[PDB]
Amino acid sequence: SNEYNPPLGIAFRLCGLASDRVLFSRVSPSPEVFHHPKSEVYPDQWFVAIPGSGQNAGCYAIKSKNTGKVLFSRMSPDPRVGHIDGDGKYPDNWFKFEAGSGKYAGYFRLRAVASDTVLVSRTSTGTDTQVINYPATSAKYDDQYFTILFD
Ligand SMILES: OC[C@H]1O[C@@H](O[C@H]2[C@H](O)[C@@H](O)[C@@H](O)O[C@@H]2CO)[C@H](O)[C@@H](O)[C@H]1O
Ligand SMILES: OC[C@H]1O[C@@H](O[C@H]2[C@H](O)[C@@H](O)[C@@H](O)O[C@@H]2CO)[C@H](O)[C@@H](O)[C@H]1O
Ligand SMILES: OC[C@H]1O[C@@H](O[C@H]2[C@H](O)[C@@H](O)[C@@H](O)O[C@@H]2CO)[C@H](O)[C@@H](O)[C@H]1O
Predict the structure, then answer these.
(1) Atom of ligand 1 at shortest range from CA of 30
(2) Strands 21-25 and 33-37, how do they pair?
(3) In this structure, are residues 54 and 63 in contact, taking their beta carbons and an 8 Å threshold?
(4) Which ligand 3 atom sits closest to the C-alpha of 132?
(5) Residue ranges per domain, the chain?
């Protein structure tokens, strides 16, 4: 239940509900993977969805149009959230977009099934831990919800 399907063949930004910031992937400067206020649109904020197959049917890899890298989410090693080359070669590259309901209609969590984690974008901690992950089979918070933007 609760599968969300992003559009294919069009780039999008991923904006956090709690943070009003969009994810990004760049090779420089550091940090390479972080988030940015949504009012400022930059080339590192654009991603496409790569459909999965087999046990990953209904999941997607999140591929940067800016670096070519896909996002990952894992419990260890550090860093727990980042990016890596390819088109989803590793299990922790495969996300179920887990559809929200109620106040979260329109939004989804980004659940890395293989690591049992969800992505987080928040402003309630210092910058070193504003973009991170959290166990997926645990409490839900607004900072785990994202939506797709085309501007
Ligand atoms: O889309 C991300 C933009 O980030 C801007 O740099 C940020 C940086 O990420 C942050 O760590 C801090 O230093 O503030 C910077 C300025 O807002 C880049 O300037 C911009 O080009 C984008 O990469
Ligand atoms: O999908 C990500 C994979 O990352 C691999 O670790 C990388 C690490 O992220 C990077 O910083 C550098 O140290 O190279 C490592 C090896 O490619 C993990 O080994 C793999 O299991 C995935 O998590
Ligand atoms: O949705 C993420 C939640 O994170 C919780 O904070 C964690 C934090 O991420 C971790 O680094 C460590 O400090 O443990 C904290 C408590 O589990 C927040 O409590 C919650 O509000 C969300 O932000």
Answers:
(1) 11
(2) antiparallel
(3) no
(4) 9
(5) 1-151
